[PDB]
Each structure stands twice: as C-alpha cells, then as structure tokens.
Design a binder for these strands. Structure first.
Lengths: 114, 271, 64, 37, 139
RNA sequence: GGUUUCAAGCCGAUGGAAGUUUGAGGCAAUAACAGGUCUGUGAUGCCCUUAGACGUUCUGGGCCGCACGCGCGCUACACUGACGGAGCCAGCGAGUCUAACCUUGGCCGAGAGGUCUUGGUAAUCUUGUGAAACUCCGUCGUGCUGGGGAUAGAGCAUUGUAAUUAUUGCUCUUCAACGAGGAAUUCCUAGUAAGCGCAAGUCAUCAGCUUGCGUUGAUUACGUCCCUGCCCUUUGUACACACCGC
RNA sequence: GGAAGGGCACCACCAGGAGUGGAGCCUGCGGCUUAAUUUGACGGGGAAACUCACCAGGUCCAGACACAAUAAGG
C-alpha cells in the first residue's frame, strides 16, 4: 500500500493522480515540468515490458535518469540503473514508489578500515 | 652498500669541524673524480638534503633535517628495523610520530626528533638517547611501558600498542581495584624516587585482552614531567597525581575512596 | 595503465640523462605524468631499460 | 566569469565588472579608487 | 553582434550553405564582417576566438560569396595580422575553385600594400592553380 | 620646570579640540629579482606533422567517501542562567531597462510561505532598516535540569531543469557525548579587549567564509630585555689549514 | 671567533583579559580508499548543472597544397 491503496488500483493510476497521492517533494517536482525524452524512454520501457514472457521477469531496461520518481506505471520492470560506471538490475517493487531511481544503485565501493 | 657507506663517511665528515666546505666532502669521501662527489652533493641539494652557505671567499655545505634519516634508515638497515615509512598519528612538540613497518610486516612507531648545522641534530640526538635510557630504566625496574626497539641516533623506533585513552573509557567493572592500582602505582613511583606530575587522563593507556581472564596491562607516557622526590615542589605534584585520579574517579567513575590515599609524608618511608 | 602502475620501481632516465620517477599513468592509454630533473623540450625520450640474462652456447669439432 | 581577458583568478565578481585582481590594479587608474589612506 | 562565436559559426554554416552567392556576400559583409572587426577591434590583445575562425572557414563553400563578402572590403577597412593568419589559414584549408581564387589574387595584388595582404597573396600562391592570364599579368 | 657638551634634543607639568613625530599609510634615486607571461616577432633548434583528441559534445558518478593525525571556528556544560511575556536603541551599506532588484501596505496560512498591489534608479521608497546583546516582570529551582542540541523519524513549503549522499526554510517528535577541560598553543592596553547582532561581497539556496558597521562595555601595564627571537655593533681571532695517536 | 653591551616588539616576557588544545559539530591540509575522491601551498577554491580542470562510457571533426587515377548517362 502506498496511501492505504490496493496494489493493482495503484498500478493503473496516471502520473498526475500519483502526484495527487504524493509527498510535497514529488508534487513540487512534477508541478514544474518534465523533459520530453523520458516519454520516449517510457515508450521503450513499455515496449520491453511487451517483450516479456508470461510468469517470468521482463526485459531489463538500462537507465541513466536517476532523479525520476518511480510512478506505479513502472512497477514490475527489471531496470539497470547507471551508477556513474555500471548498470545494476533491480525489479521495481510496490515498496519502491515515490523514490528516485538514484536511491537504488550504489555509486562507489565501500571503505574498509578495520 | 657503497653509496650508503660514502653517505656514512660524509656523516662522519660532520664530526670534524663546523659548517663543512666543498673540498672536505670531496676528500673525506675519497672517491674517484669530480663526478661522484659533485653529482651526489647536487642530488643532496635538490632533495634539500644539503644547503650552500657562501660566506665570503668560503663555500660551505649546510645539512638540514632532510639528509640524515636515510643514514638512520641505513643504521636501521643494520639493526633489522623498518622497511616502509609513513602514517601520521600525532605531531608532537619535540617529536613527530609516524606509523611504519619492517621487512617482517609488523607496524611500528617512528618518533623523529626535531629539537641549524649541528645543534638541532645533536639536541635531537641527546633527547632520543635520554628518552631511550629512561625507557630502559622503566623497563629494567619493571614498569609496564612500551618496549623499545632502537634509538637511531635521533629517531626512536618502538612498538605499536593497541590502546585508547581513558577519556573515551566510560568505566570498568572492577573500579575499586582500578583505584587501588592507580594509588599503588604512584606509590611505586615514589618508591622509585620519582613523581610523574602529568598523571592525567590522556597519559594512562589501557590494553584490553579479554573479558573473562582479565589479564591486561597499562602504558604510562609522561617523560618530560617526571621529577625526583628531592626537588622543591614534589609534595603537591604527588598530591596532584593522587587527586587527579580521585577527581576523575569521582567525576567519571563516580567512585570515592574508602581507604585514605597516600600522602608524601606517607611515602617518605618508602625508597 | 597497468604497464605504468606495476612498473614503478624501475627508474626513469631521459635520453638526455635526466633521472626521474613516475607518479602514475595520466591517461588510460599509458600516457603518464612524470616528474623529471629539468625543463625538457618535447624532443627527448623518456625511457626505461630492462635486462634479460644471456647464457653461452655449445661448440663442436669441425673436420674440414 | 571573466568576460574581458579570460582572467578568472581573483575577480572583483562584485558589480559585474569582473576584472582579476592582477588586471584590476592595472586598470585601477581608470575608474578612480586610488590611494588616500 | 551580440551572439556567441558558436552561434555565429552555426549561423554562418546555415547562411552560406543555403543562401546564394550575393546573399551570403551580404550576410558575411554585414553580419560576419562587423562582428569580426568588433571582436578583434574592441579587444586589448586584438586576437580572435576559434569558432569565428571556423565560421570564416565554413563561409568559403560558395567562393563568390566568400571573396565578394569577406575579404574585399575588410582590407579596405584596415586589416591587421591576426586577421591575416586566421583568414589565411581559412583561405588555405578549404578547397576553392580556381576562378574566384584568381579574382581574389587579382584583387589583393591591386591593394595598398600591407603584410596582411602579403600573407593572403602568399596563401593564394600556395595553391598553384590554373590561373587565367590576367591574374598572371596582375602578378 | 628637570635632563643634555647645559648645543641640536629627551622627559615631567600647565594651557590647549588635538603636546608619544595628534596617528597611520602611498611617493621617489641607487643597489637584488630567470621573479610571472607576450595566446610577440625572427627560411629560429627539434619530436611528430592528424586517425591524437589538443578541439567538440552528450549522459551518469566525483571534487564531500572514512580506524586516524595537524588546525581554525560555532554551540554548550547553566540560577550574573534557560523559558513566557512586555519596552523597542543604532550605524555602514545596497537596490530593478530594455528587467523581475530592494519591497511598504492589505488578506490567507501554526509557520514555512502564498496572494493582491504600491513606493523607490535612490539623504526621497524599502528606512527611523523599531538588529542582537540590553531593561523590567512572571515560570523554573540546581537536579546531564525546564542547560545543551548532536543524531534520527514524519510531513509541509521555497529557489533551482535536476535537491538522491537529505540546497534550504517550517511543524511535532527522537534528547547523544559534554559537570570549566592535559601535555602544549594564540592575541591584546580605551571604546582597545570581550560579548553582541546588522549590512556589503562571495549569493540561483544556505555560513560555521571574508569585510565594514553600530549597541553594551571590563581587568591590568604604561616596565623589562629575564624567556622567545630579531637585529645593531665592539673586537679576543682565522691553528691562514700545525702535530698526532688513528 | 660560541666575547660582552644596548634596543624594543604583546607574531617576546611580566600585571592580567579572552581563549585554543577538553565535548559535539562546521571547515582547510595530510593519510587511507577508489573508477575518480581533479589539482596547488587560503588559492575569490563558497557550494547538484556550468564553473571543472577528474572518472564510466557514447560520440563528431580532423589532412592543407601538390600529385596518379576516377566525370556531368554520374
């Protein structure tokens, strides 16, 4: 549940209704605007979702736009997020809504002292 | 071997006179031609290992702090010591403390001393020798203290010890025995004939072995503050040690003494 | 770049005889950033020398 | 950003005149801020 | 004259690769020449940026437009030596048809003498094209 | 009036706005700077002459990462104090055009903020910048407390295309070390220190960054070369390079 | 010449005042780590883009003139 809402009811929501259920950061992000190129990226994303076999994982789509709000349109896709060097493929969950894509890809090696 | 031997020779070409001219470093080395001596002195000067003092009609060569420690490293190549150099933990007043390692791979501690022309070097040498002999006296009496490896003329190389100061130590379980320890150890100091006036929180270092066997020790580093009991002001020095222990154990460990602490007149029937 | 990295102990000599030592490979194409003696022009050769141990070879009689 | 002689080092970025402190003391005798006290 | 040299470069590519020989003559003579002389004239070291150099390079694709628009009133307005080196490297790098190079040399030999004009004539003599005999007689 | 060959001068006191050269800084001539370039000119010397990116881009991560060391600052360890009210005291600045600067006022919102305008290109409006510290009265009652505010959670707004490793602002909650601090270290003689905030540059948003401004306003010297050094000199001198053991 | 004598200074001492080093945190350097933690000894070096000088990649655009071929049905 994102606001106490069932999952499949969330899935078929538009972007703007998810802004109607969003926190202040997501609302003010979408209220200023969005670039035209992620629309074609979402068309490629849904085409690769249409290239998915039944009862399995979809085609992983590689992504650079780390600042994009995970809208419930993209729940279930296997996405390889680019950390600055490499792509990391994670299945988008309903637990991942409202987040940037940058929150799910570590961009550096850990520092080991002791 | 050979270049280090000739650098040892011009090290031995320092304990002859004052600020050494060019032909003495030519001839004390006793090398073949102008090549080896002049290109070696230029390699010294470009690495700031030597300097030129041109006092009228008189060239001379001024050794700074740089071009000494190699020889000490050579002196420590002789005595099985350090191979790799450099990790800064603590820049003190009369020494600079580094974390180093041997050929064997164990990390050690390199205290270089910087206390020119002869006197900076020589007083660093006297400081290193004096601290090495004081460390020898403490380990010969049996004081728990870091074990010295060597004193490479003015750079003291010793062991590393896994400890952390008492300011970040909340408490232990055996607090009254720790108070009896930090009373009886100053009693042992007065029985040595000395009083370490800076017996503060940052001095006392505790190694921590286990939590069941309780077989641990202590490390006390108060070297330019130890004062013999015969001096003018040792009474309240001893009392400052005792009372800093007591005020720390009242403030931090919340422990008050049930036995009365030792005075100087108590410890006058000691050593 | 590993050519520059793993070979650091071997000293740099310039073809003009100027010594030096590497810092690292500035480029990933092995273009490297080095500290030298002096103000070189772009005309000299930064160089290293590596040595293979050679061994003598047999002999046989020769009857004309 | 230095828009005069590509001299970003020490811009005086105040008021958009944008001269470096080297060339600001070159052109110091053209504006009028001079030595009084 | 308030554009960037990237904008002048792209607009010169657009307005030489599309406009005709007289039209890009007017473009280069009005817009490129005055912005050119104001970039070099109003500067204290009297040099030029790299993208105006690329603009003058791309302006030579129609050679009638280049020589009738750029070079011919510039030397009559005062040509200095950075303009000489930059537009001579322009005049050297792009392959020009021989007739308008010949008309350019016939122009530049007639001018009041200047070492910039000497650099331009030196670049036009680095071509060794099939010159008409009038261009040879002007030499 | 002392002191001084009773000279150029110094010191104590009186009158004086000002009596230590009333105090600070810029200015030359002579004797050192390869000190830092000019995108300079010269059939200059010289590795290539270009598949190199040196030029361009376009994305996403950095420049912030953490056993630790060297250092400066902010905030505290409270009752000469924190909270709740009231009084409401300055000055230096700074402000918009062929743009969105400084904003007064009025309504909405707990606030952040938002709306609607208006004034000022400026000793005019912001502005009397009703700043902070301060003054008074109540709550607290010495209890890591009602001192502290680090850390963390939740949302809400603002600038920015993009706020994620939170730009920042607002609300509630979570309330850590820290009971005047070692070896050692810095600066300083009157509106100076110290405490305080404000303004201007960094400013698309914020300072704990730098500079000027004003409010309140100590203690204690006005002595010294004893430490720290810095010089200035005087000259005992080079053993003018000697012997050796080694 | 390692003689002694003066300045004359709170980057020196005495009379002190505020302090730092003690706690937490901001910020600069070193070290470690990395793919890069760009680079100097405040660099007007305040800071997601730029500034960026560093990485993971993806790319344009090179190279003049001469000269042998190739031609407007290409």
């Amino acid at each position: 549940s994102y606001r106490g809402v069932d999952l499949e009811k969330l899935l078929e929501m538009s972007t703007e209704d998810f802004v109607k259920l969003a926190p202040a950061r997501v609302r003010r992000r979408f209220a200023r605007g969005m670039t035209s190129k992620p629309a074609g990226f979402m068309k490629k994303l849904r085409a690769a979702k249409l290239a998915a076999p039944e009862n399995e994982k979809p085609a992983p789509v590689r992504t650079h736009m780390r600042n994009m709000i995970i809208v419930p349109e993209m729940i279930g896709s296997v996405v390889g997020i680019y950390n600055g060097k490499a792509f990391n493929q994670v299945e988008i969950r309903p637990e991942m809504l409202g987040h940037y894509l940058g929150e799910f890809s570590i961009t550096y090696t850990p520092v080991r002292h002791g | 071997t050979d270049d280090f031997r000739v650098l040892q020779a011009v090290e031995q070409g320092s304990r002859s006179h004052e600020v050494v001219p060019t032909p003495l470093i030519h001839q004390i080395s006793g090398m073949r031609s102008q090549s080896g001596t002049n290109r070696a002195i230029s390699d010294l000067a470009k690495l700031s290992l030597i300097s030129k003092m041109r006092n009228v009609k008189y060239d001379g060569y001024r050794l700074t702090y740089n071009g000494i420690d190699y020889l000490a490293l050579k002196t420590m190549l002789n005595r099985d010591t350090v191979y790799s150099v450099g990790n800064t933990i603590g820049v003190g007043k009369e020494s600079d403390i580094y974390k180093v390692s041997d050929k064997n791979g164990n990390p050690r501690v390199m205290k270089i001393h910087r206390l020119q022309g002869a006197n900076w070097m020589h007083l660093s040498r006297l400081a290193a020798n004096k601290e090495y002999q004081f460390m020898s006296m403490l380990y010969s009496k049996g004081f728990k203290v870091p074990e010295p490896f060597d004193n490479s003329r003015h750079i003291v190389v010793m062991e590393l010890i896994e400890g952390y100061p008492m300011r970040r130590l909340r408490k232990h379980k055996n607090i009254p025995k720790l108070y009896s320890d930090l009373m009886c150890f100053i009693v042992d100091l007065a029985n040595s004939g000395l009083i370490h006036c800076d017996f503060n929180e940052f001095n006392i270092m505790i190694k921590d072995k286990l939590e069941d066997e309780n077989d641990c020790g202590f490390v006390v580093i108060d070297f330019p503050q130890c004062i013999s009991i015969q001096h003018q002001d040792a009474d309240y020095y001893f009392q400052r040690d005792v009372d800093c222990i007591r005020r720390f154990f009242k403030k931090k460990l919340k422990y008050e003494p049930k036995p009365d602490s030792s005075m100087l007149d108590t410890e006058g029937f000691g050593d | 770049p590993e050519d520059v990295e793993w070979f650091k102990s071997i000293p740099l000599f310039t073809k003009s005889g100027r010594s030096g030592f590497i810092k690292e490979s500035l480029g990933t194409h092995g273009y490297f950033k080095a500290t030298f003696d002096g103000k070189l022009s772009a005309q000299d050769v930064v160089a290293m020398s590596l040595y293979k141990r050679m061994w003598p070879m047999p002999s046989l009689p020769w009857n004309g | 950003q230095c828009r005069v002689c590509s001299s970003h080092t020490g811009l005086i970025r105040k008021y958009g005149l944008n001269i470096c402190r080297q060339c600001f003391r070159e052109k110091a005798n053209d504006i009028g801020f001079n030595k009084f006290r | 004259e308030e554009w960037s040299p990237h904008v002048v470069y792209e607009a010169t590519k657009l307005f030489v690769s599309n406009l005709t020989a007289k039209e890009s003559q007017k473009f280069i003579n009005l817009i490129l020449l005055e912005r050119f002389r104001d970039n070099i004239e109003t500067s204290e070291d009297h040099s030029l940026n790299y993208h105006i150099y690329r603009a003058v390079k791309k302006s030579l694709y129609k050679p009638s437009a280049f020589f009738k628009g750029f070079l011919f009133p510039l030397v009559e307005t005062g040509c200095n030596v950075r303009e000489a080196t930059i537009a001579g490297s322009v005049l050297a790098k792009v392959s020009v048809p021989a007739l308008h190079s010949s008309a350019a040399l016939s122009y530049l030999l007639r001018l009041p003498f200047s070492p910039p004009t000497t650099v331009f004539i030196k670049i036009l003599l680095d071509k060794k094209y099939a010159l008409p005999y009038q261009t040879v007689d002007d030499c």
